[PDB]
């Protein structure tokens, strides 16, 4: 993963039960952007007509 400048405080219920409040800098610096390569196939079979 990444090294995240973390803090420990409640902050307005946005990290309430187990939640995580995340900066926009984490999204801006693209530290948690992940590539996901899906294969998507198409098959020409032999139908009857």
The Cα–Cα gap between 20 and 2 comes to 15
Residue 22-41 contact track with another protein, rule CB under 8 A, x = bound:
xx-xx-----x-x-------
CB of 12 to another protein, least distance (A): 5
Tell whether residue 9 is a contact of another protein (CB under 8 A). Answer: yes
DSSP, res 17: S
Discontinuities after residues in the chain (C–N over 2.5 A): none
Nearer residue to another protein within complex by CB, 18 or 39? 18
| C-alpha to C-alpha distance for 2 and 33, rounded to whole angstroms | 11
Return the number of the residue (39 or 48) whose C-beta is nearest another protein. Answer: 48
């Amino acid at each position: 993963g990444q090294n995240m400048r973390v803090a420990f405080m409640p902050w307005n219920g946005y990290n309430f039960e187990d939640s995580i409040l995340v900066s926009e800098r984490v999204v801006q610096e693209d530290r948690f952007t992940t590539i996901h390569i899906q294969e998507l196939a198409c098959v020409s079979r032999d139908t009857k007509l």
